[PDB]
Amino acid sequence: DLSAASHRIPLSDGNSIPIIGLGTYSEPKSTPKGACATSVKVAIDTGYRHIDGAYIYQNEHEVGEAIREKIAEGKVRREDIFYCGKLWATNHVPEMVRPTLERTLRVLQLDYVDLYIIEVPMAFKPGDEIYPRDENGKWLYHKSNLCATWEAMEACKDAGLVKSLGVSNFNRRQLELILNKPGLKHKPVSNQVECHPYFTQPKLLKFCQQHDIVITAYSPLGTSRNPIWVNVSSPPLLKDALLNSLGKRYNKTAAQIVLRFNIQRGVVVIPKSFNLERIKENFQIFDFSLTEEEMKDIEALNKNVRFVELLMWRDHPEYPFHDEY
Ligand SMILES: NC(=O)C1=CN([C@@H]2O[C@H](COP(=O)(O)OP(=O)(O)OC[C@H]3O[C@@H](n4cnc5c(N)ncnc54)[C@H](OP(=O)(O)O)[C@@H]3O)[C@@H](O)[C@H]2O)C=CC1
Numbered sequence: 001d002l003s004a005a006s007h008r009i010p011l012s013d014g015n016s017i018p019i020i021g022l023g024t025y026s027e028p029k030s031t032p033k034g035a036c037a038t039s040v041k042v043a044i045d046t047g048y049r050h051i052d053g054a055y056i057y058q059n060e061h062e063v064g065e066a067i068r069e070k071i072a073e074g075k076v077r078r079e080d081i082f083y084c085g086k087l088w089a090t091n092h093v094p095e096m097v098r099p100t101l102e103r104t105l106r107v108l109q110l111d112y113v114d115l116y117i118i119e120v121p122m123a124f125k126p127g128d129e130i131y132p133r134d135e136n137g138k139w140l141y142h143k144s145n146l147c148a149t150w151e152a153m154e155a156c157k158d159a160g161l162v163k164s165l166g167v168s169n170f171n172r173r174q175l176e177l178i179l180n181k182p183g184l185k186h187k188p189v190s191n192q193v194e195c196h197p198y199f200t201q202p203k204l205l206k207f208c209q210q211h212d213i214v215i216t217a218y219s220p221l222g223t224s225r226n227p228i229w230v231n232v233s234s235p236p237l238l239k240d241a242l243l244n245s246l247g248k249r250y251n252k253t254a255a256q257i258v259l260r261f262n263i264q265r266g267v268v269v270i271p272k273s274f275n276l277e278r279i280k281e282n283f284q285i286f287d288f289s290l291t292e293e294e295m296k297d298i299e300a301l302n303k304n305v306r307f308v309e310l311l312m313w314r315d316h317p318e319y320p321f322h323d324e325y
Pocket residue numbers: 022023024025026052053119168169192217218219220221222223224225238253255256270271272273274275278279281282308
């Protein structure tokens with residue numbers, strides 16, 4: 001039940017997802033071209049069979065290059081690889097959903113994506129511009145209609161362009177809007193949100209479990225802590241005293257402890273690293289386990305403080321972080 005060779009958990013639609021994957025976000029201005037492609041190939045050699053990306057990260061093509069090359073080499077087959085892509089805020093308009101996915105398919109040079117999700121529940125003004133703002137720097141929004149957007153997504157699955165459908169950054173109310181939708185064809189199988197020892201998501205996780213929705217934890221190591229956008233007010237997760245002390249009990253790092261914590265609770269983790277050594281390190285989480293006591297010690301570290309607040313959009317009608325969960 002969870003080994004390096006076998007670690008996929010069931011999704012409610014019949015498919016499965018590798019409990020750990022490689023995250024690929026990285027600040028453009030300072031990330032050398034090819035770093036992503038090289039990192040993805042290293043991840044595959046190491047044992048990863050899940051990659052998390054997004055067209056807006058500006059390196060989706062590099063993910064395709066690495067996946068296609070590893071298939072060409074015969075290291076893996078397409079069906080062995082699980083790739084997750086995301087529909088951005090500026091693409092919520094129903095008629096723009098399929099064209100957006102197809103563009104990503106051209107970028108990857110693949111026939112389908114294993115998981116496609118609505119990146120944020122907030123709709124932004126349609127266009128090529130990813131971060132639309134008017135002359136006065138004010139954010140250009142659009143009226144959201146999550147049920148209409150979801151229907152367009154379902155049609156994408158019916159056409160064979162994506163295996164499983166999901167969401168990201170959705171709160172309880174937003175999930176329920178979809179779940180109780182009349183004529184619902186494909187239930188969301190996953191909700192990707194921030195999750196780690198400082199923000200354990202106890203109520204949302206419990207809610208998702210009740211509806212057989214699997215949570216994928218983004219920023220599982222606590223983010224890169226880039227001041228430009230990260231809530232630096234909260235202390236660096238990997239420097240946590242207890243996590244480090246627990247690490248010495250099994251000769252593992254804090255990073256390895258936090259990753260084991262979530263996977264052991266049935267939570268998918270997608271740590272990002274473009275460093276040869278760290279990529280390998282993050283994968284060594286199947287040769288040990290945390291005791292029931294230790295899981296409770298780690299859970300008690302919950303501060304209910306997000307490292308990713310997205311405050312610039314707190315004025316959007318569908319901003320997901322006002323509600324308790
Ligand atoms: N849908 C959404 O709204 C969002 C989705 N995401 C997704 O979730 C993924 C989660 O990763 P992310 O948010 O970037 O942050 P993470 O918490 O995964 O990692 C942040 C930093 O950790 C470092 N790191 C990795 N391994 C180790 C280690 N063993 N020891 C010390 N430092 C380490 C990396 O540096 P280095 O590369 O030098 O190793 C990196 O800069 C993303 O890459 C993205 O795919 C992220 C935010 C939002």
